[PDB]
Coordinates of C-alpha atoms in Angstrom, one line a residue:
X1 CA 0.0 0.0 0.0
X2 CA 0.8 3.6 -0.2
X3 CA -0.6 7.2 1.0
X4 CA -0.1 10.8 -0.5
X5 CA -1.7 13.6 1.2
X6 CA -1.3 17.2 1.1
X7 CA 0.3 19.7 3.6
X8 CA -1.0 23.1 3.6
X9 CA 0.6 26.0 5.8
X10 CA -1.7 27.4 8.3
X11 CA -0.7 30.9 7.8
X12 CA 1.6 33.3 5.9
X13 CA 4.9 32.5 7.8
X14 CA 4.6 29.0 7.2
X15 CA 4.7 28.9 11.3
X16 CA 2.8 25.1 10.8
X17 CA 1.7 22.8 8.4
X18 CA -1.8 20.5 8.4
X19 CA -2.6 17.7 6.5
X20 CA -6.0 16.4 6.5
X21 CA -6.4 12.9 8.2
X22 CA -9.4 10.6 8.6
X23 CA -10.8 8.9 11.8
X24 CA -13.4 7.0 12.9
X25 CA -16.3 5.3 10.9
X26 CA -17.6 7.2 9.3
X27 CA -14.9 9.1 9.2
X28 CA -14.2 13.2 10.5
X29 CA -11.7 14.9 9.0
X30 CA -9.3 16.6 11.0
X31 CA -6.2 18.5 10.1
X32 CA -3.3 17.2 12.0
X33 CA 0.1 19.2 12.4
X34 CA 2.7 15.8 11.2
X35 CA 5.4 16.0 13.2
X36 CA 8.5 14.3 13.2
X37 CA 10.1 15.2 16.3
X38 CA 7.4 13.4 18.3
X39 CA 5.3 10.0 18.8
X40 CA 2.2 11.2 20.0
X41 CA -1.2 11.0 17.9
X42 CA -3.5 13.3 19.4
X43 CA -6.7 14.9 19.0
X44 CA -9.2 17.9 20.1
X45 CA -12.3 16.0 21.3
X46 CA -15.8 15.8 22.5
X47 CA -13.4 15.2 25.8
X48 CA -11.5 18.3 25.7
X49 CA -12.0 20.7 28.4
X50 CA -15.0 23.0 26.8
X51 CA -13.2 26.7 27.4
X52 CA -9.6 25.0 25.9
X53 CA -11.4 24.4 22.3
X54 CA -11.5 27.8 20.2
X55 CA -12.7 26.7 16.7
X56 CA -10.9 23.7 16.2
X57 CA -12.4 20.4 14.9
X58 CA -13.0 17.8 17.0
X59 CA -12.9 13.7 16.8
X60 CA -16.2 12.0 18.8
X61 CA -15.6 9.1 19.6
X62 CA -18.9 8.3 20.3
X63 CA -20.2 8.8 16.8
X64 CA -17.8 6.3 15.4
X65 CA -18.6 2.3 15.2
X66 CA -15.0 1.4 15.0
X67 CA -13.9 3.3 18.3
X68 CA -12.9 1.0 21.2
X69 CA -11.7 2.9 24.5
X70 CA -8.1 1.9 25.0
X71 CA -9.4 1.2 28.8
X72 CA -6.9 2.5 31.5
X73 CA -4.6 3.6 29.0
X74 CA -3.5 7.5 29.6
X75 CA -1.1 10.2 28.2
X76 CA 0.7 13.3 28.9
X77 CA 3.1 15.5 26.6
X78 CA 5.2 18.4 26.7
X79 CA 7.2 19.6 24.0
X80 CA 10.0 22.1 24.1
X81 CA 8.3 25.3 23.4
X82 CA 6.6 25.1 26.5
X83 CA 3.2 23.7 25.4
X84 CA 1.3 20.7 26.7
X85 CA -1.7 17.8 26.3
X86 CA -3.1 15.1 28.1
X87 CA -6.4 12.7 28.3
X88 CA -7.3 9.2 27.5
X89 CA -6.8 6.7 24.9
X90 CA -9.0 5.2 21.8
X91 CA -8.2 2.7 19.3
X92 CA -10.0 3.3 15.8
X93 CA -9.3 3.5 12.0
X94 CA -7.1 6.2 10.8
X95 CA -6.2 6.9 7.1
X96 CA -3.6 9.3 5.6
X97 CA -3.9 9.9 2.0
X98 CA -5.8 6.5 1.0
X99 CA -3.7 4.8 3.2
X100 CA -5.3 2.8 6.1
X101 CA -4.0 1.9 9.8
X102 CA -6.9 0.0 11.7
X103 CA -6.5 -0.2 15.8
X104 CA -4.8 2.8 15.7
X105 CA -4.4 4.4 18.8
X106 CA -6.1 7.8 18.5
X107 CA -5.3 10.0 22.1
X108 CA -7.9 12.2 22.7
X109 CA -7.3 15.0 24.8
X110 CA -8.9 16.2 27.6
X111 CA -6.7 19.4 28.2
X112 CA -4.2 21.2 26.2
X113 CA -2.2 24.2 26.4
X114 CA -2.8 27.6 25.9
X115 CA -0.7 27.8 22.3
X116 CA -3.0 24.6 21.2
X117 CA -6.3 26.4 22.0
X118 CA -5.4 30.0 20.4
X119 CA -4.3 28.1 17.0
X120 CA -7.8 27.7 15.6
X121 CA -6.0 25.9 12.6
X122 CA -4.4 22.4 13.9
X123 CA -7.2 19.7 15.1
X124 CA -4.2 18.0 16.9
X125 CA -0.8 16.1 16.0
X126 CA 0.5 13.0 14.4
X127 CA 3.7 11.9 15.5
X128 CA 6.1 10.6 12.8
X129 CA 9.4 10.0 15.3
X130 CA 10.0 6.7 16.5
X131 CA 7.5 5.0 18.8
X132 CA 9.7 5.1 21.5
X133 CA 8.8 8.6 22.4
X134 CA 5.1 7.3 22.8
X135 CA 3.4 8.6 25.8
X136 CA 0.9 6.6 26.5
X137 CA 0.7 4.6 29.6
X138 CA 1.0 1.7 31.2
X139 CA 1.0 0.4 27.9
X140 CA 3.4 2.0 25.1
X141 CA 1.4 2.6 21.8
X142 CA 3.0 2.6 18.2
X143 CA 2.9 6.0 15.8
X144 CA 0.8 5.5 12.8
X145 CA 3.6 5.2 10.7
X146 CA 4.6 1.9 13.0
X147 CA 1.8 0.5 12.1
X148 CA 1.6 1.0 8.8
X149 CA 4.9 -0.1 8.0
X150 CA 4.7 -3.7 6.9
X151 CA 1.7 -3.4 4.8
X152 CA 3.7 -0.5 2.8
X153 CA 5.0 -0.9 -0.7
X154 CA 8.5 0.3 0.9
X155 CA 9.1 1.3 4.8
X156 CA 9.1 4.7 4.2
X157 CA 7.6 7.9 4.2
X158 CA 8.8 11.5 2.6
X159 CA 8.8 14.8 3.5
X160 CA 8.1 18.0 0.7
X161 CA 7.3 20.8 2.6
X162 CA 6.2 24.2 0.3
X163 CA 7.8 27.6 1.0
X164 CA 4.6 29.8 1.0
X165 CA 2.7 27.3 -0.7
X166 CA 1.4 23.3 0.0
X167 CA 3.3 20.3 -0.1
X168 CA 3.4 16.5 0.4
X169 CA 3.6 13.5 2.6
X170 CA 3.9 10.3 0.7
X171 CA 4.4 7.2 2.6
X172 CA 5.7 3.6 1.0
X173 CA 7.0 5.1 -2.3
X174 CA 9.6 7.8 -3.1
X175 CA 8.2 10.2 -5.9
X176 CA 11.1 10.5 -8.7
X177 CA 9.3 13.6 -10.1
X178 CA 9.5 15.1 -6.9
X179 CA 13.1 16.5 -6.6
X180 CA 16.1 17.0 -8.7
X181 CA 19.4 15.2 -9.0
X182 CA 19.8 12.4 -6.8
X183 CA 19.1 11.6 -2.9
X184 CA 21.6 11.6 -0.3
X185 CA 21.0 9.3 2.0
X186 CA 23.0 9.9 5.9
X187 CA 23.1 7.7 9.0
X188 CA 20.3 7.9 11.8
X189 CA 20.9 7.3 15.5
X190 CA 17.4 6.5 16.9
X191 CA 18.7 6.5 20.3
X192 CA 16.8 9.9 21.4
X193 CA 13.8 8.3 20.0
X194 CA 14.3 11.0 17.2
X195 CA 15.4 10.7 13.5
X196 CA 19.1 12.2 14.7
X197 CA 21.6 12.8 11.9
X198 CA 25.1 15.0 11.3
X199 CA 25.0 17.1 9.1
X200 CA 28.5 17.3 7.2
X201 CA 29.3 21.7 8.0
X202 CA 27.7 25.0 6.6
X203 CA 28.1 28.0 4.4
X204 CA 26.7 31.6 4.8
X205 CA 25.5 33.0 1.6
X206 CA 28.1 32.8 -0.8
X207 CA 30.9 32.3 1.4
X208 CA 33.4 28.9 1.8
X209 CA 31.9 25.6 3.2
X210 CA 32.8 24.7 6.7
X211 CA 33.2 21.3 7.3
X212 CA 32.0 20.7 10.6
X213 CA 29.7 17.8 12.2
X214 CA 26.1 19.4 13.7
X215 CA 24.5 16.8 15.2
X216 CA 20.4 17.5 14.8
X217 CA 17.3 16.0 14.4
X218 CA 14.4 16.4 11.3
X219 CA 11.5 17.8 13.0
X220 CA 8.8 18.4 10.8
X221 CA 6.7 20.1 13.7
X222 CA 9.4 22.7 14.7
X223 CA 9.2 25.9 12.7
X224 CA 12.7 27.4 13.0
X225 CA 16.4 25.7 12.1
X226 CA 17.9 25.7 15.3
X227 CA 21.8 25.1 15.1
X228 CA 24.6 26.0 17.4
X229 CA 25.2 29.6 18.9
X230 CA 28.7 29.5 16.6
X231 CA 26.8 28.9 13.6
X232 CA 24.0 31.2 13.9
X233 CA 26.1 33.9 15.1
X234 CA 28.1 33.4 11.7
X235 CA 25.1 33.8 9.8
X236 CA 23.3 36.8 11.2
X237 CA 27.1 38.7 11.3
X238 CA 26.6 39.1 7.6
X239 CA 23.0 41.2 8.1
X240 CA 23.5 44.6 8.9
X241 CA 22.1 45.4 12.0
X242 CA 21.2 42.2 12.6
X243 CA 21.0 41.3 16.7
X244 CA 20.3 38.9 19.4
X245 CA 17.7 40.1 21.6
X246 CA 16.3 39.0 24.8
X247 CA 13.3 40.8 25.0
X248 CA 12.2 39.3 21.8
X249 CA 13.8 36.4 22.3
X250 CA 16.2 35.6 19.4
X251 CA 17.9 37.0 16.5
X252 CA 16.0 40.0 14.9
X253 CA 17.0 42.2 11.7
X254 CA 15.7 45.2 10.3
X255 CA 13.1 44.3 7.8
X256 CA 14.8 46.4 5.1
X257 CA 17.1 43.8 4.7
X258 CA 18.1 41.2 2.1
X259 CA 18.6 37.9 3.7
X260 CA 22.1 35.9 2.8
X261 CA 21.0 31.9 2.2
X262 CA 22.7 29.2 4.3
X263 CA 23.6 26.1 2.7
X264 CA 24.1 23.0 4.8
X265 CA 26.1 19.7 4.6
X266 CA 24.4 16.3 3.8
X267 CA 27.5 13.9 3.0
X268 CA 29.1 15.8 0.0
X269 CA 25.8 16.8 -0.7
X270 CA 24.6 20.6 0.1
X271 CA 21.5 21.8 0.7
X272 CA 20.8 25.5 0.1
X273 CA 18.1 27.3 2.0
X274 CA 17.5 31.0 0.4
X275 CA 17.2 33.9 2.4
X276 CA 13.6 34.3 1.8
X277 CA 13.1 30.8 3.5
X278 CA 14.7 32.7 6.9
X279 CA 12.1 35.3 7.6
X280 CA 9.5 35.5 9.9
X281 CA 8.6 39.0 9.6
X282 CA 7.7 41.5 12.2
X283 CA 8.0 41.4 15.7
X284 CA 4.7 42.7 16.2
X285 CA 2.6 43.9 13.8
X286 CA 3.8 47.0 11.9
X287 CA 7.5 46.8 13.6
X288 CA 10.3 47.4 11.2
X289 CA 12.4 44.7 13.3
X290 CA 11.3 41.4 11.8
X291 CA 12.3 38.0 13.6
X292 CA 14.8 35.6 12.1
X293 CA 14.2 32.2 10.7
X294 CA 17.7 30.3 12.0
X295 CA 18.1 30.7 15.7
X296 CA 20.6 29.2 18.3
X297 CA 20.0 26.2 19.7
X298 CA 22.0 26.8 23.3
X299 CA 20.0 26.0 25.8
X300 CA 17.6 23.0 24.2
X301 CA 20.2 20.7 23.9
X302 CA 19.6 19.5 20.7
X303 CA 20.0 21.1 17.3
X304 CA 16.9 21.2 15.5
X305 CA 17.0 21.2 11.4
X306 CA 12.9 22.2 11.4
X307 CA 10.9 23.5 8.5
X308 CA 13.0 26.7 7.6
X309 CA 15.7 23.9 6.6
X310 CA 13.5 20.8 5.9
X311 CA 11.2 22.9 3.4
X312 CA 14.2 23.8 1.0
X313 CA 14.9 19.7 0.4
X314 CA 12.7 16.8 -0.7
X315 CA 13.5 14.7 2.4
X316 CA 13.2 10.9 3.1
X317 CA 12.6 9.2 6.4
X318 CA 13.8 5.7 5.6
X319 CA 12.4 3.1 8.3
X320 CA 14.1 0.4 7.2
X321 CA 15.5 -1.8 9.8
X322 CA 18.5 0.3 9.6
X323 CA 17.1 3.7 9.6
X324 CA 18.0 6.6 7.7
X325 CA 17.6 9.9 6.2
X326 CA 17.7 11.0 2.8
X327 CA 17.8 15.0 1.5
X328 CA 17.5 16.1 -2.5
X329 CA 17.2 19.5 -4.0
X330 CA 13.9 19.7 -5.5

């Protein structure tokens, strides 16, 4: 079998991406935010605490004949901007794309986090790291992907996230009309739970490689390319008037300027992300400081090659017994 579904941005910044997903019998549609850097699929609910639900779309189990209640089965998340979830379990029939998982466990939540409830836009998440990272207790559940696997044409899934504009997630094929040139493929260390590379160095603009290892993960569900203070202090020297700031909290530049790219490393391989890829925009609305798109990563512990890097490559998430990553030009 195979899927292909579409990923749209949720607003003009590209701050998120939502793919449509099907639950239940018959099914409701929500749009999930697909997320690499986690293991977690959750939903808004009938459950879900009545004032933390602010337009999103919910999943009932109720009103679908294939739910089962995952009896005494729980979960709690927090990710590393700060937000949260939690609530109870089902099992039901998910499907990405044409692509079918039945017993899939589906956590529905009974609270979230203020940043879930103010984004109208994303119905919940679907983790796409490795299963691992589940949170479900006492008995660890597998990501949708997981369970998909064996019934796939090939165990893998793809990545081709749009600058201002949709994209695609294909699982169990790789699309040759997708990207140019060939695919680089680079080792994976699963043993975060994460799909954890090295990435071979970096350039600024049109300056000389730097061959340096940056060890990082591909995070679909983190916005920003988060690398290490060196790096990104390299890169925002060549913007005048460019500055860290902790009020604001990162790297800002004056919106009059004209953004350098930043290439990085894949093996031999180099991936270049333009300038236009690296900003956010304003501050605050009508502010002629606009925030920046690559930001350090001291202080999380991790580097974090998210959608301002991932969105400039056609990228393959290999689950083969040996994992590992693959990144094209497209």
């Amino acid at each position: 079998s195979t899927g292909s579904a579409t990923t749209t941005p949720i607003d003009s910044l590209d701050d998120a991406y939502i793919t449509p997903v099907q639950i239940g019998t018959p099914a409701q549609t929500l749009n999930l935010d697909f997320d690499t850097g986690s293991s977690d699929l959750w939903v808004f609910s009938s459950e879900t605490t009545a004032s933390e639900v602010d337009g999103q779309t919910i999943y009932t189990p109720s009103k679908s004949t294939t739910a089962k209640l995952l009896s005494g089965a729980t979960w709690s998340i927090s990710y590393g901007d700060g937000s949260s979830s939690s609530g109870d379990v089902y099992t039901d029939t998910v499907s990405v794309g044409g692509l079918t998982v039945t017993g899939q466990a589906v956590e529905s939540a009974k609270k979230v986090s203020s940043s879930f409830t103010e984004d109208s836009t994303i119905d919940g998440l679907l983790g796409l790291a490795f299963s691992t990272l589940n949170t479900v207790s006492p008995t660890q559940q597998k990501t949708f992907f997981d369970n998909a696997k064996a019934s796939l044409d090939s165990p893998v899934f793809t990545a081709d996230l749009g600058y201002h504009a949709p994209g695609t997630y294909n699982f169990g094929f790789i699309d040759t009309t997708a990207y140019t040139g060939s695919i680089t493929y680079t080792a994976v260390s699963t043993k975060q739970g994460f799909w954890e590379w090295t990435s071979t160095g970096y350039a600024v603009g049109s300056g000389t490689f730097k061959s340096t290892s940056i060890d990082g993960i591909a995070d679909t569900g983190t916005t920003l390319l988060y690398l290490p203070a060196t790096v990104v202090s390299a890169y925002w020297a060549q913007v005048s008037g460019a500055k860290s700031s902790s009020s604001v909290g990162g790297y800002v530049f004056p919106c009059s300027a004209t953004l350098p790219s930043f290439t990085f490393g894949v093996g031999s391989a180099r991936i270049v992300i333009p300038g236009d890829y690296i900003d956010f925009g304003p501050i605050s609305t009508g502010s002629s400081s606009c925030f920046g798109g690559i930001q350090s990563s001291a202080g999380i512990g991790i580097n974090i090659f998210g959608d301002v890097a991932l969105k400039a490559a056609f990228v393959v998430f290999n689950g083969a017994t040996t994992p590992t990553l693959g990144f094209a030009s497209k």
